[PDB]
Amino acid sequence: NWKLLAKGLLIRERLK
């Protein structure tokens, strides 16, 4: 779950 969330955060940041 740490990898999942970390990558979610980085995906979101990029899309913004």
Next chain:
Amino acid sequence: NWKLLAKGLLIRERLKR
């Protein structure tokens, strides 16, 4: 491993508007 990838796909899709 299947789970991470599956959830990763769902997370990416959610984040797209």
Next chain:
Amino acid sequence: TEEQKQEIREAFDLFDADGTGTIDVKELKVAMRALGFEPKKEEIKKMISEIDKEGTGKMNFGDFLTVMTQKMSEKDTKEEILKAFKLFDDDETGKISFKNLKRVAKELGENLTDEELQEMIDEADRDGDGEVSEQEFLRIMKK
């Protein structure tokens, strides 16, 4: 949710016109249908056995609400898993191939060798046809 709980009460009450507080367990299939499920034969067999462990032939509303809550949760989980399957199966071949899996892993910045990707296919590939069906994916997503 209160609106969903109300809908479940209304479906139960269809089969309790006499207001006994119970319905015949044999009405389960039609009650479930009213609520938008289409349970398979094996699913009905298993549920009836689970609902009526004392063998009375009858179920009360609390029993019915518990099972319908479970089934709704299970349906939501299934639909989500199937949404993920489609995200793997981007070529719409109805199966997750080694190609789809490699593409996903790469896209998600996950570094896996072909041997490691083949190992995932083999793990999921219960029927031995070399790719991953919806049923196989469902199975492996709930473990």
Next chain:
Amino acid sequence: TEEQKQEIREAFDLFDADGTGTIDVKELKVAMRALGFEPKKEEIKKMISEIDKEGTGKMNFGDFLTVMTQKMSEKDTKEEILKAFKLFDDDETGKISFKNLKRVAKELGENLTDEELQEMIDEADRDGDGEVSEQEFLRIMKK
């Protein structure tokens, strides 16, 4: 890229003014510094052992280039991992707390129970202080 491959070449040649094609392995720290790395004592010890497994005391360009490409890629991912750390640690306390994790899971639409979130803290919290440091996060990410 070729641009950075040239910076690496220029840094190497600083320590080979006699044009032998080798430099003393003892110059590794200063050469890495030239390239903008500040390796710790333990890292230097490890690299020198790794680079000079035959014990000659010298290194050639191909070997320098190999190690520097690896350190560059390691650096890029560390920086990206710490970008994610800062995205968890939005209160800038320097640790990822249970609160930070819960917030992230909610914002990203992952339904984790408090028990599952606590499990994640415990998994990462190697030093036992109840929160997750950059070192712990780096560890749990690079595995």
